[PDB]
Amino acid sequence: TRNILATPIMNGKDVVAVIMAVNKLDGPCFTSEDEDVFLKYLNFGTLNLKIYHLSYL
Amino acid sequence: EVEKFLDSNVSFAKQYYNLRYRAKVISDLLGPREAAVDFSNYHALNSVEESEIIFDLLRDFQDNLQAEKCVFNVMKKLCFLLQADRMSLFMYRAR
Amino acid sequence: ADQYFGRKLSPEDVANACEDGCPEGCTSFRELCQVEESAALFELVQDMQENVNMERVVFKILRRLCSILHADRCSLFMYRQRNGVAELATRLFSVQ
Amino acid sequence: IRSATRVMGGPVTPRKGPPKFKQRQTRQFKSKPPKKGVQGFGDDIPGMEGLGTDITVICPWEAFNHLELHE
Amino acid sequence: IRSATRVMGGPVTPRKGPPKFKQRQTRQFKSKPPKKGVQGFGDDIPGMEGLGTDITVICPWEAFNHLELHE
Incomplete structure (x- = not known):
């Protein structure tokens, strides 16, 4: 592994999971414009993981 | 410059495009904005690029779902799509 | 056949009646890449109708997020606590 | 194949050391510290937050x- | 105050009749009938929605x- 990009997923003040995006293929490293695509596209998976966590409780 | 017009085939084209431009479009569609559709004319029932109502509805699935504003917001557009005058919501209980 | 980046981006204007334009009303590449994403998003919302599938839907989100970023692999770690200490297990590995 | 993690026996772990076990739950209280900024699903249950009484009785001046x- | 329903002071009903009050429950049987229909959120709790303890005792041959x- 050479490059890494990761973020947590939060329910209130608690953590539920962690996601990773190892190993970018063309540039030397991940640019700064991808860090907003990441957050704005994980907004839908956040809802599903929060629903799963709530159903488990 | 102009000699680079082998693009009469659409194979390398749209491939370069989704390689180098999709990110900006998908990052501005999902950001804070407002839909661009006229809501007075009752026109064509709809078109295909015109279905950005899907994005407008997804934009509110972000946080702290109040469960009252979202239903109101979807009904306020379902009223326009159906071409109806009034809509209402009844809730279920048992005593 | 080669890639000359230059700065010429003007060949992204309105396109004439051409092939691979099956949707009705698309007049630009932007419209195509918008409608495709909208359809892909309406799917996977049709899959949370009943019996929420934590494994399946996240898998289909990751398969798209790996293509968008040009990355080579992706993953998912779950969080749990045993006798007071916290730890992170594995639930999805090497999705490509 | 090999489940993509290349381990078949059981859960493996990087660290090693002496085990640590938990203490029993001796004393309980009805109170929690005041709330933080952000909230999520399942954080509004009556009686599971605060001091068990309305803020009026603890702080009468806050009523009006x-x-x-001026008055 | 329009109130969107033109009613104030208390709920209104189309028809009225003599009151009916619920009856207690005594027997409290454990088991449940077999489950049919779509699942939906809020099901699959292990202890509930089941007969006895396990399937094997109910149908001893089901193991095979x-x-x-031919066997």
Whole structure:
């Protein structure tokens, strides 16, 4: 592994999971414009993981 | 410059495009904005690029779902799509 | 056949009646890449109708997020606590 | 194949050391510290937050906090 | 105050009749009938929605499910 990009997923003040995006293929490293695509596209998976966590409780 | 017009085939084209431009479009569609559709004319029932109502509805699935504003917001557009005058919501209980 | 980046981006204007334009009303590449994403998003919302599938839907989100970023692999770690200490297990590995 | 993690026996772990076990739950209270900024699903249950009484009785002056100090 | 329903002071009903009050429950049987329909959120709790403890005791032959007729 050479490059890494990761973020947590939060329910209130608690953590539920962690996601990773190892190993970018063309540039030397991940640019700064991808860090907003990441957050704005994980907004839908956040809802599903929060629903799963709530159903488990 | 102009000699680079082998693009009469659409194979390398749209491939370069989704390689180098999709990110900006998908990052501005999902950001804070407002839909661009006229809501007075009752026109064509709809078109295909015109279905950005899907994005407008997804934009509110972000946080702290109040469960009252979202239903109101979807009904306020379902009223326009159906071409109806009034809509209402009844809730279920048992005593 | 080669890639000359230059700065010429003007060949992204309105396109004439051409092939691979099956949707009705698309007049630009932007419209195509918008409608495709909208359809892909309406799917996977049709899959949370009943019996929420934590494994399946996240898998289909990751398969798209790996293509968008040009990355080579992706993953998912779950969080749990045993006798007071916290730890992170594995639930999805090497999705490509 | 090999489940993509290349381990078949059981859960493996990087660290090693002496085990640590938990203490029993001796004393309980009805109170929690005041709330933080952000909230998520399942954080509004009556009786599971606060001090068990309305803030009026603890702070009577806060009752008519609408009117200023002029009166 | 329009109130969107033109009613104030209390709920209104189309028809009225003599009151009916619920009856207690005594027997409290454990088991439940077999489950049919779509699942939906809020089901699959282990202890509930089941008969007895396990399937094997109810149908002792069911252990040999994968086997064919001839054996």
